[PDB]
Design a binder for these strands. Structure first.
Ligand SMILES: [Mg+2]
Ligand SMILES: [Zn+2]
Lengths: 585, 74, 248, 147, 397, 308, 234
RNA sequence: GCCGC
């Protein structure tokens, strides 16, 4: 009981801890609370009178309902709850309508989008449940993902596009080498149109440093930058360098600056910074007026020449085959290889044409810069799209075939800007159907695996502080042949050392033992040349019926070491099983 | 209104014990026989207890002692 | 404009027909606009017929041949009034209009060839920096509505077996708190929320009424008991040859 | 553990998924219970039994004078499906796979559950011995130990 | 559930359900036909020498595989000869270059591989096949609005779908329109064709608002005015979501492609108030409620306007029989039909006799089992359909 | 120190199209006056719209009329587009009767005292046989914005008979507004701007009057920023306690315990009220017996207790 | 009913320090928050009278890039410091002020010569730091009144570079407004739900008080409409 | 059968 459901829309005016609740759902989810408040205020003497008054929905009932919703958190949940981020707590905001308004920053964690998704609503009618919702399950509490530690609540899509557009440069724009006293003046000139975000100008800038122990030191230095970067600097909290905003902020700088703010400043500042970032990104993305036009998909001029040359190779190799000195396998493999080479060459030509498309004059002569093409900006910012999508849109669709796994000899030489033939579309339908059928079948195989993992791991709780064991596991970077994928810092961060770490200088020890390793310690050991670190693991806890809090490092959801009473088994099962729907089988 | 309880969490650091301590204090202020030790800003007893914890004048030990003193008074 | 659509939905979906349809709709509405303007000023039938003829025989060797010469003078007026809103273009599935044809139709309608125009913010009056694509698109309303998809329950009827609330709207049911939801609550460490979901407010027959009375009294204390589903399970297992009991 | 962590991470890293190695090692630990016995002297002889019970029993036997009583053991490796059906609680592992297979053995052996895990307390309807319910379960344990 | 190369001109490789039934439910291609034995066929144009002929043959999967079939989009001359020597063809489940003489058949049309529903997507070849699947599937969920609006951009298949579906009214033997009305059309058949004796005229009863299987509204409106000549096969009245005989299942919106302050984040759509004011995307929904009276052990169940223990306010909208007046606006739990069932009682207690003495003879012994509007249902009385048993008294309504 | 715009050169293209010029303007003020004027004129202009209809035979909208080519819904949608200009009234009734053949238009609406039909060739209906008539009563009201028929309920305060044909009211006579800023021809001044406003309406509101109304609205709204400055209810309770008709001994006991109102008493529990001297076990049930006939059990909980 | 519009009441002003204010007005009709906020911001950010430093004459090198005779601060930073100096000129269209300083120490605004018709709001404003040597600095700055913001695009005065060297092309900020921003939120009154709540945040150079700036901006905007509100006046 | 994955 005390449950609801409807379609979700977006609320961009919402704070991170807020959600928009239809006022018709409330007055039903909170009926006993309304009865109690009605009887307490003397409006209704009997429960029958309160029930009749609520049934008629008078205005005083709406006033009482607002007070009931004044300070009572609520839970929203999306139907395939792969992880605990599946349900999050919010403070309801009463709205006129029939759809739940959801904050855009939690959509990624919910895996939700506004094309028909619905959520359920639950009310915690208990002092203990209300506190648990406020202290454990609120959105402002769970910002880091408890699977890798990276921020799960991050800007995306229009926020990334707006921030990327704001922090860009143009070689010649309104304002050049202009000197400004304050970033607000740059914003004032920008509002007047005197200052251009693309235009690069010098403004007086100041910074605060946490290097003094628990103290920030002011540092005022005039710096080179653009108008948009100075305008965005007004949002950054104190204690962050100015070098964090003199960049494209391509959706990776934004996550990095959020992570640095969390690690240096705390949670309340990062929660605010994120809200401000989403607001300003939306506003400037709207102001930019970005649009997609048929002319943005630029086909390279040399595409037809490459196609014709490849056709010449196909004809000559077949003639070599007709002469009889080439077997079927040889010619088939060679044709596949040359078609792949031609596809790569045409894709490279397309990307080279589309990257620095803007050849722009300067104060003297002419220069070339990064293009302001809308599709290229979408791909470069990381807001949406990739190279493979753009390559298909403006370059060849490429070699593909999935009737049984083989490859059709002649590829699709047409993009989507040009039309496809009936034959090429029929060929692509095979891969389309294969992917769509794989999606609707692998889901079970993943859910069964998640069930088995949860059922095997549910009985694991941190029940000790420190077991004192000296056992551990050696940790080294993942080097495969000549290529490395995982540095030592990633595999070591947030772990407790089983043994002392010695530098190449003998006897000398950079770090102590049984010590959790954080960003400072990892940076210190990265300056030196340590390659192997012994860290204690849960497989050697030495504690029966549970693990110690020292053999398990810090929990990834909070930078501190994990506390007793945390169900680590369910966390591990959910974090392993949440992907798998995206694993290609 | 407190969006973030960090301060309250750090006052006695477990993220689990504080939820209980605040439930005990909120029961005291809600069922009866208790008045807030901080000004009341038209907010609910839950956040009142959380703010009292953040201000440093409420913890599990004081609840145990105040209870002992009031039991000895009767 | 009537609708505002996100450009970010196009490039990662490879929905290029959206943009081409928008451009061609802009061209069609431009031709209709020209015809409407001509009809407003009551221009003589000859030049209106001439413009309709010029618009109909445009393209690159299209099969459709239509001449207004064999058209009645009144029928020309009726046709012009019928296509006063816009010219209904038709592009067959794999054999249709090309970019150049769309561009020359745009030129005949006296519109920018790129399909992008200058737009102004309605709240501030400022011009947007980049040109924004504006045109006409065919939009549908599907059979999914919030009214047919908004449900909220506080307390209703319950199944005789398991003493648990019914499911689904049109029956005033409650939302199912499944296994993964319970896993998430366990992962959070929210024991009291889980106990209040698992016991009272679900299958505790006495706990439900006690909790309702406490909430009406403004107490907010769970006082949890034992679910009836576990009693049903005990009876079902005892109905086999197996004796199952609760020790003290 | 190194073989399992490296092998499973290869699948995930190839697709671009970041998962901390702690989570994989948590599930390997649950796979490393149920040690066998290759000795005797402590009422264990050639049988599959819990690792924790062996270490607890050995420590008690080694604590006393008869240190040689402690039995040498060989650790096993079970699958996640086979390890979850080998738990000492019959209420769980009957809610996961097939009840008839588990309920039949439990009836013959006459075992007890004692409700020490998360699944068992969820079914009964009690607070979990984790999170905010961890303290409540601890206080009850002292009362049982103290009578 | 995969696409087979023999699916070419028989089943469209786009239209299919998504989740559980993918690849198991298919649709016929627009030209496909079934063999007498029961095997799917598709038409091809014969090719003799280097010139295609307008004669058309239907070939099953084996028949098509045996011959080299050219592509629909291969250029031809005035005499019918291919402009380009080397042409693209399908020989045996594959495709490659062959000489024009090598080809034995030619694809009749490009659409030959597209379903009728997909045939309605303009610029389909610039859309992803899996994505197009979604568009074709979603095209069939659209609900007709208050007024039909033609597509500004189409494909030319709207007329065939509109007419062949039987939704419109088509002149079977059209002559000249004699009388027009919102509910009837009368046509005076031309004298050039007639059935001897009794002469004859054509009467069409246009369908007015009526419930559909999905509770939408099906309505027909005339397209002809008066004294209008009408030929055979012309459209007289169009049904739901049809405009002058063309399929019109949506509306033409003026759209800008830009981000607007986070209100179109993800797939959200920002709509102006002029769309709401102009009643575009407004639909009519029709619901059916029924009440039945059956004899009971207590006795017959009677339908009456008078109801025990009910105030005059609930009986304001009832007829003398006890039914809501046609055109009444009903909300909440208003009473539609007044029905009373008898109760069982044969021991007259003195209090019961007293109750019968002060109050009516029944003393409200008869229970109340009436048809009330379910909560959440606001409707206006549109049509009442009283049916009466043979022998029992006919209802006053 | 600023020049003030003047209303000069107001030219009217068509009956609906018009141009308004504000000749003298400073550097930036062109848009500040413009965009503000466009927003005010598109949002809040008064007008008159058809509110409800009463056709003879038709009682609802989903029916048809014999002899009439269009449905009732189409007739109502046609009437929604009828533009009128009433003077001195807000609830004129536009009677319309016409029997015969051909489209029925506003023209043949009965000539009211002070009601102007801006375009009389606006068709609303069609007749298809000689022996058919249409007769309807149309109510026109004055308003400001879009008021849907479903959203208004105060009209249901008095019961409306079966046969009403209400239609959504828009009340806004402005359809399109565009503005543009040019350079003023004044050569003595260094550089001045001129604002030109094009408004397309339904012929109901004058252009100059519309501009005056918008400017007046803007001035009244700005008047607030010119000088910002600024820097126990239920009737059964709160009733005399001598309304329960209690016994004699209760009167002194209630007076002794300072029980003078009804609400304060119902806040007394049994166990604590028994502690009062000489209350009496049987007399206590008498107190409860009387308060039970009112429906007021002892032990209630009010929040604030006023002196009255 | 008609011709009657909602008026804001119980408006809240939050004054921070002495140059920062936050004004909240509620309730407003739908769309009026954006109209009022945009008009007020535009006039405040573009058309407001005030006095500012526009020309600077330093004894020594008159080039834009100069050795600065070892004054420890680049001439660009000197012009930046004089750009932010705020003055209150009384009854003068223009006035020339000269400041000369000797001996190690920071040059503040109080070191300018005293003129009875010119007021300095921040005497602790720092112009140039000491050369670090017993050197002497002579400065000649003239403050003139104007409107809005006039960037130093070009001088176009006197002949050739005679005025540009004398002016040194200092950016002129006549308007006494540092920042002006507004936000429109959702407010509800009685049964109505779609109303505007306007929040204005403004900071000032210190010559004027935020509320006074709002009053002046609204006053000039209202006086601009007199030619249309005069006859049509209540 | 359909919708959201
Ligand atoms: Mg979705
Ligand atoms: Zn350990």
């Amino acid at each position: 009981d005390y449950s609801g459901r409807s379609v979700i829309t977006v609320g961009p005016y919402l704070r991170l801890h807020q959600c928009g609740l239809p006022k018709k759902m409330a007055l039903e989810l909170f009926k006993p609370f309304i009865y109690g408040k009605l009887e307490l205020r003397g409006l209704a003497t009997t429960i029958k009178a309160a029930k009749k008054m609520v049934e008629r929905e008078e205005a005083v009932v709406w006033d009482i309902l607002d007070e009931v919703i004044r300070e009572h958190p609520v839970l929203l949940n999306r139907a395939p709850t792969l992880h605990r981020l599946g349900i999050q707590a919010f403070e309801p905001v009463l709205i006129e309508g029939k759809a739940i308004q959801l904050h855009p920053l939690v959509c990624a964690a919910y895996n939700a989008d506004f094309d028909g998704d619905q959520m359920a609503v639950h009310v915690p009618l208990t002092l203990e449940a209300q506190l648990e919702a406020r202290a454990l399950m609120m959105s402002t509490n769970n910002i880091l993902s408890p699977a890798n530690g990276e921020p799960i609540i991050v800007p995306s899509q229009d926020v990334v596009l707006g921030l990327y557009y704001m922090t860009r440069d143009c070689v010649n724009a309104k304002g050049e080498g202009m000197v400004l006293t304050g970033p607000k003046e740059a914003e004032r000139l920008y509002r007047s149109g005197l200052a251009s975000l693309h235009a690069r100008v010098k403004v007086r800038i100041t910074e605060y440093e946490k290097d003094a122990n628990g103290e920030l030191v002011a540092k005022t230095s005039l710096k080179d930058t653009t108008v948009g970067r100075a305008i965005l600097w007004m949002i950054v909290p104190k204690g962050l360098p100015y070098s964090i905003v003199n960049q494209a902020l391509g959706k990776k700088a934004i996550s990095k600056m959020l992570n640095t703010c969390y690690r240096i400043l705390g949670l309340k500042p990062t929660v605010i910074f994120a809200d401000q970032i989403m607001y300003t990104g939306f506003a400037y993305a709207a102001r930019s007026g970005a649009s997609v036009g048929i002319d943005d998909m630029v086909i390279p001029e040399k595409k037809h020449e490459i196609i014709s040359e490849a056709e010449a190779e196909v004809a000559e190799i077949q003639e070599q085959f007709q002469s009889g000195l080439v077997t079927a396998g040889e010619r088939y493999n060679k044709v596949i290889d040359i078609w792949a080479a031609a596809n790569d060459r045409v894709s490279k030509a397309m990307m080279d044409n589309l990257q620095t498309e803007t050849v722009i004059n300067r104060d003297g002569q002419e220069e070339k810069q990064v293009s302001f093409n809308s599709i290229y900006m979408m791909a470069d910012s990381g807001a949406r799209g990739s190279a493979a999508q753009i390559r298909q849109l403006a370059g060849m669709r490429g070699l593909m075939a999935k009737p049984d796994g083989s490859i059709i000899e002649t590829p699709i030489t047409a993009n989507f800007r040009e039309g496809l033939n009936v034959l090429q579309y029929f060929i692509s339908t095979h891969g389309a159907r294969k992917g769509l059928a794989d999606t609707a079948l692998k889901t079970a195989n993943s859910g069964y695996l998640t069930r088995r993992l949860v059922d095997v791991a549910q009985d694991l709780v941190v029940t000790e502080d420190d077991c004192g064991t000296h056992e551990g596991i050696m940790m080294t970077p993942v080097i495969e042949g000549g290529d490395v994928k995982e540095p030592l810092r990633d595999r070591v961060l947030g772990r407790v050392t089983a043994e002392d770490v010695l530098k190449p200088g003998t006897a000398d020890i950079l770090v102590p033992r049984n010590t959790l390793l954080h960003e400072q310690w990892c940076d210190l050991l990265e300056e030196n040349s340590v390659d192997a670190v012994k860290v204690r693991s849960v497989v050697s806890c030495d504690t029966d019926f549970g693990v110690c809090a020292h053999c398990y490092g810090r929990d990834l959801a909070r930078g501190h070491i994990i506390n007793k009473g945390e169900a680590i088994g369910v966390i591990a099962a959910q974090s392993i099983g949440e992907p798998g729907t995206q694993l290609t089988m | 209104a407190r969006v973030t309880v960090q301060d309250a969490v750090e006052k006695i650091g477990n993220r689990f014990d504080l939820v209980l301590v605040a439930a005990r204090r909120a029961r005291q202020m809600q069922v009866g026989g208790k008045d807030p030790l901080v000004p009341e800003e038209n907010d609910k007893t839950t956040v009142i207890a959380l703010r009292e914890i953040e201000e440093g004048l409420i913890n599990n030990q004081i609840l145990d002692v105040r209870e002992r003193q009031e039991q000895q008074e009767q | 404009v009537d609708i505002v659509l996100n450009p970010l939905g196009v490039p990662s979906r490879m929905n290029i027909g959206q943009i081409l349809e928008t451009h061609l709709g802009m061209a069609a509405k431009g031709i209709g606009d020209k015809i409407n303007a001509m009809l407003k000023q009551q221009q003589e039938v000859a030049k209106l017929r001439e413009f309709i003829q010029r618009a109909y025989d445009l393209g690159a060797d299209v099969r459709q041949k239509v001449d207004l010469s064999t058209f009645s003078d009144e029928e020309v007026m009726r046709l012009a009034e019928n296509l006063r809103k816009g010219m209904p273009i038709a592009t067959p599935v794999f054999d249709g209009a090309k970019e150049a044809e769309i561009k020359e139709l745009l030129k005949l309608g006296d519109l920018p060839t790129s399909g992008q125009i200058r737009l102004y913010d309605g709240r501030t009056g400022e011009q947007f920096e980049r040109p924004v694509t504006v045109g006409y698109m065919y939009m549908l309303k599907l059979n999914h509505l919030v009214d047919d998809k908004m449900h909220a329950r506080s307390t209703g009827s319950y199944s005789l077996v398991t003493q648990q609330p019914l499911g689904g709207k049109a029956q005033f049911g409650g939302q199912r708190f499944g296994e993964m939801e319970v896993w998430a609550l366990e992962a959070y460490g929210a024991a009291y929320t889980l106990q209040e979901m698992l016991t009272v407010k679900s299958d505790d027959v006495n706990g439900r009424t006690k909790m309702y009375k406490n909430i009406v009294d403004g107490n907010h204390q769970m006082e949890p008991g034992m679910p009836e589903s576990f009693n049903v399970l005990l009876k079902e297992i005892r109905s086999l040859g197996i004796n199952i009991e609760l020790e003290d | 553990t190194r073989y399992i962590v490296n092998e499973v991470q290869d699948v995930y890293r190839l697709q671009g998924v970041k998962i901390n190695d702690k989570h994989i090692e948590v599930i390997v630990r649950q796979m490393l219970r149920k040690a066998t016995i290759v000795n005797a002297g402590s009422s264990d002889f050639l049988e599959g039994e819990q690792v924790e019970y062996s270490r607890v029993k050995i420590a008690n036997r080694e604590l006393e004078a008869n240190g040689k009583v402690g039995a040498t053991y060989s650790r096993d490796l079970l699958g996640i499906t086979k390890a979850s059906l080998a738990t000492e609680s019959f209420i769980s592992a009957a809610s996961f796979q097939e009840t008839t297979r588990v309920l039949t053995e439990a009836a013959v052996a006459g075992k007890r559950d004692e409700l020490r895990g998360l699944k068992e307390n969820v079914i009964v309807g009690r607070l979990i011995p984790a999170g905010t319910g961890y303290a409540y379960h601890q206080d009850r344990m002292r009362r049982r130990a103290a009578g | 559930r995969d696409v087979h190369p023999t699916h070419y001109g028989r089943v469209c490789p786009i239209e299919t359900p998504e989740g559980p039934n993918i690849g198991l439910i298919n649709s016929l291609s627009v030209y496909a036909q079934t063999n007498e034995y029961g095997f799917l066929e598709t038409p091809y144009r014969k090719v003799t020498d280097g010139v295609v002929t307008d004669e058309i043959h239907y070939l099953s999967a084996i028949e098509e595989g045996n011959y080299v079939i050219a592509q629909a989009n291969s250029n031809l001359d005035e005499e019918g000869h291919f402009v380009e020597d080397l042409v693209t063809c399908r020989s045996k489940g594959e495709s490659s270059l062959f000489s024009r003489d090598q080809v034995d058949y030619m694809d009749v049309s490009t659409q030959q591989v597209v379903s009728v529903g997909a045939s309605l997507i303009p610029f389909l070849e610039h859309d992803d096949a899996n994505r197009a699947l979604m568009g074709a599937n979603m095209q069939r969920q659209a609900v007709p609005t208050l007024r039909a609006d033609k597509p500004l951009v189409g494909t030319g298949m709207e007329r065939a779908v509109a007419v062949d579906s039987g939704v419109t009214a088509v002149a079977k033997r059209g002559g000249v329109v004699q009388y027009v009305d919102a509910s009837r059309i009368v046509i005076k058949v031309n004298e050039d064709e007639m059935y001897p004796g009794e002469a004859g005229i054509d009467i069409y009863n246009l369908t007015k608002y009526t419930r559909s299987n999905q509770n939408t509204c099906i309505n027909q409106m005339p397209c002809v005015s008066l004294g209008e000549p009408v030929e055979r096969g012309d459209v007289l009245a169009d049904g739901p979501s049809t405009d002058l005989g063309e399929l019109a299942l949506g509306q033409n919106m003026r759209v800008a492609f830009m981000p607007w302050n986070g209100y179109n984040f993800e797939d959200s759509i920002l709509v102006s108030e002029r769309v709401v004011q102009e009643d575009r995307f407004t639909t009519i929904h029709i619901q059916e409620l029924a009440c039945v009276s059956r004899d009971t052990k207590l006795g017959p169940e009677e339908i009456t306007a008078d109801i025990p223990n009910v105030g005059e306010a609930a009986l304001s909208k009832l007829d003398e029989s006890g039914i809501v007046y046609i055109g009444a606006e009903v909300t909440g739990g208003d009473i539609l039909v007044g029905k009373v069932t008898p109760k069982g009682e044969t021991q007259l207690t003195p209090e019961e006799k007293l109750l019968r003495a002060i109050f009516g003879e029944k003393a409200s012994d008869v229970k109340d089992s009436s048809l009330r509007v379910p909560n959440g249902v606001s409707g206006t009385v549109i049509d009442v359909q009283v049916f009466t048993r043979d022998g029992v008294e006919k209802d006053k309504r | 120190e600023f020049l003030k715009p003047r209303l000069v050169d107001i030219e009217q293209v068509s009956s609906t199209h018009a141009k308004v010029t504000l000749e003298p303007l400073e550097r930036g003020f062109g848009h500040t006056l413009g965009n503000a004027l466009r927003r005010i004129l598109l949002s809040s202009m008064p007008g008159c719209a058809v509110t409800e209809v009463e056709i003879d035979g038709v009682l609802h909208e989903y029916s048809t009329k014999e002899g009439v080519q269009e449905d009732i819904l189409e007739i109502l949608l046609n009437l929604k587009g009828l533009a009128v200009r009433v003077q001195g009234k807000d609830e004129v009734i536009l009677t319309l009767n016409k029997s015969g053949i051909g489209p029925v238009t506003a023209a043949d609406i009965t000539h009211d005292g002070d009601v102007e039909i801006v375009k009389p060739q606006h068709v609303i209906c069609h007749l298809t046989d000689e022996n058919a008539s249409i007769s309807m009563r149309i109510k026109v009201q004055r308003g400001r914005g879009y008021v849907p028929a479903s959203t208004r309920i105060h009209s249901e305060e008095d019961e409306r008979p079966i046969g009403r044909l209400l239609v959504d009211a828009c009340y806004s006579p402005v359809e399109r507004i565009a503005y543009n800023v040019e350079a003023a021809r004044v050569e003595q001044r260094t550089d001045l701007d001129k604002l030109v406003i094009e408004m397309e309406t339904n012929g109901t509101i004058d252009p100059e009057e519309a501009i005056r109304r918008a400017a007046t609205i803007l001035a009244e709204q700005l008047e607030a920023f010119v000088d910002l400055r600024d820097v126990e209810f239920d009737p059964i309770l709160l009733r005399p306690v001598d309304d329960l008709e209690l016994t004699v001994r209760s009167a002194n006991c209630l007076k002794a315990e300072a029980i003078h109102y009804i609400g304060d008493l119902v806040q007394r529990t049994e166990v604590e009220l028994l502690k009062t001297p000489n209350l009496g076990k049987k007399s206590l049930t008498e107190i409860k017996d009387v308060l039970a006939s009112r429906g007021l059990s002892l032990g209630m909980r009010l929040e604030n207790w006023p002196p009255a």
